[PDB]
Amino acid sequence: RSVASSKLWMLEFSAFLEQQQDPDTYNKHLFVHIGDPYLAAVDIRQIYDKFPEKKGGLKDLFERGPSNAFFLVKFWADLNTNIGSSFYGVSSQYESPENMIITCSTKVCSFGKQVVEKVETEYARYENGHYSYRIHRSPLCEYMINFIHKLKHLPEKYMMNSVLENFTILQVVTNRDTQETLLCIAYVFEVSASEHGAQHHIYRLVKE
Amino acid sequence: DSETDLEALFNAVMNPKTANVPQTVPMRLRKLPDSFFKPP
Ligand SMILES: *C(=O)CCCCCCCCCCCCC
Incomplete structure (x- = not known):
């Protein structure tokens, strides 16, 4: 139970290209x-500038808490792709002790400024003495598809990382009715250099 | 200008002489764990 607060655990998260x-x-x-x-632990003050500010922004969300809902994920993305049409998707799975209606909000940012937001509402399914929530094959927005295509058409990987220096994604999972923050995940990216493929590090976001 | 301009973002890196984007502190230089830059 890594990416988990007291009320919600994200067991699975993946972005993919299906051909x-x-x-x-x-x-x-x-x-x-x-x-x-x-x-x-990572001091959240070190990343505030990379995410939306003002009311409802990362600082406001963190200050309202709970503090145990806040995570930072560093991805080394695998961009080694190939080439019937294709599908860019995102899938994720969650578990809760509670029967909730949850809202998942994903904001894609450049220089800390929101470019696009995707919003999804999910209902619970009973499973083995708990409740499961699944976002399955959610279509990746056109901005992200274009972003990926533009990344691959850069001559060198150092250029890819330079672009990614200012590209972030903020995921906020909320109880629709109470507005409690269940999970807040900040995503930062580099390109994977290793032949072993995509890699990640998960951090707890702390105040001081 | 627009900070969310996708073309400008990529142009800044492809053609640095014409770069017109916000100037930032690179992650490399921030107070972060060494693991942040060293993959598993
Ligand atoms: C549009 O609908 C925005 C939805 C964003 C979902 C996050 C998917 C993560 C993409 C990772 C790909 C890596 C590219 C460097």
């Missing part, structure tokens, strides 16, 4: 994937 080879054949490329460990 149809023929009517019965599909190829899936994972860009990034997450699937009692000790998570290192």
